[PDB]
Design an enzyme around this catalytic site. Structure first.
Site, mmCIF file in Angstrom:
data_model
loop_
_atom_site.group_PDB
_atom_site.id
_atom_site.type_symbol
_atom_site.label_atom_id
_atom_site.label_comp_id
_atom_site.label_asym_id
_atom_site.label_seq_id
_atom_site.Cartn_x
_atom_site.Cartn_y
_atom_site.Cartn_z
ATOM 1 N N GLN A 19 0.808 -1.221 0.000
ATOM 2 C CA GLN A 19 0.000 0.000 0.000
ATOM 3 C C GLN A 19 0.846 1.279 0.000
ATOM 4 O OE1 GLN A 19 -1.643 -1.138 4.052
ATOM 5 N NE2 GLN A 19 -1.816 1.091 4.227
ATOM 6 N N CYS A 25 -5.391 0.671 3.350
ATOM 7 C CA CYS A 25 -5.461 -0.799 3.734
ATOM 8 C C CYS A 25 -6.882 -1.318 3.590
ATOM 9 C CB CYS A 25 -4.875 -1.243 5.076
ATOM 10 S SG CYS A 25 -5.233 -0.131 6.459
ATOM 11 N N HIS A 162 -6.168 -1.086 11.395
ATOM 12 C CA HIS A 162 -5.499 -1.535 10.172
ATOM 13 C C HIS A 162 -6.173 -2.785 9.615
ATOM 14 C CE1 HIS A 162 -2.154 -2.028 7.343
ATOM 15 N NE2 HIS A 162 -2.109 -3.301 7.695
ATOM 16 N N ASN A 182 -1.119 -9.299 4.684
ATOM 17 C CA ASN A 182 -0.973 -7.861 4.893
ATOM 18 C C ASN A 182 -0.634 -7.179 3.568
ATOM 19 O OD1 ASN A 182 -0.924 -5.419 6.285
ATOM 20 N ND2 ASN A 182 0.562 -6.101 7.820
#
Length: 220
Positions: A19, A25, A162, A182
């Site tokens: 990102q 996110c 997040h 992630n």
């Protein structure tokens, strides 16, 4: 339910993304979940556009690089009748003007979305056994930030900040874990992924069970 699930093993997970310097996110989590269900329902893995969500999916609560919500991400894709590919609408890590022409190009669609009942790891496990699931967790702490290997057991808060995507679960050495995708690139964690403790109860590890959701496609 199965003892082990890994959506990467059946080709339902796109290679790790980054990102960059943008709090987008929520968009990466939305996209990873949509990529997953599209592979599961149709048989094809297609990398989809986070930038489109950033530019075109702004709401009162969802604000591009200033954070947002996966439910708004799913809502956009439903409302729009689809989403463009990563290749056609590439990621810039910056808020830009919504490209209306690219917004009109639709390669993947979803029909609906559902929320996993809050604070319920069993319901979450049930959902993950079927598909990748969008979740949010507390990722701001030093230990989470510097995670490199093993099963993460904290310390971490619970105040979601997040978004990530659960792409499986398992058990190693008697410790249950979720597999988390992630969006910090391949240099973080286990080549972009984290194994994080599972079956701890309540809000789940780092609050992972607080705000889970997933996209729905009616037909397989």
């Amino acid at each position: 339910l199965p003892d082990y699930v890994d959506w990467r093993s059946s080709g339902a997970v796109v290679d790790i993304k980054d990102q960059g310097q943008c709090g987008s996110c929520w968009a990466f989590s939305t996209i990873a979940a949509v990529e997953g269900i599209n592979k599961i329902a149709t048989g094809d893995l297609i990398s989809l556009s986070e930038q489109e969500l950033v530019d075109c999916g702004r709401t009162q609560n969802t604000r591009g690089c200033d954070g947002g919500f996966m439910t708004d991400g799913f809502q956009f894709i439903i409302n729009n009748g689809g989403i463009n590919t990563e290749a056609n609408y590439p990621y810039t890590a910056e808020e830009g003007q919504c490209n209306l022409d690219l917004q009109q190009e639709k390669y993947v669609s979803i029909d609906t979305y559902e929320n996993v009942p809050y604070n319920n790891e069993w319901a979450l496990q049930t959902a993950v056994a079927y598909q990748p699931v969008s979740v949010a967790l507390e990722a701001a702490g030093y230990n989470f930030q510097h995670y490199s290997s093993g099963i993460f057991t904290g310390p971490c808060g619970t105040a979601v900040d997040h978004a990530v995507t659960i792409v499986g679960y398992g058990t190693e050495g008697g410790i249950d874990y979720w597999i988390v995708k992630n969006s910090w690139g391949t240099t973080w964690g286990e080549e972009g992924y984290m194994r994080i403790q599972r079956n701890v109860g309540g809000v789940g590890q780092c609050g992972i069970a607080k705000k889970a959701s997933y996209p729905v496609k009616y037909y397989n």
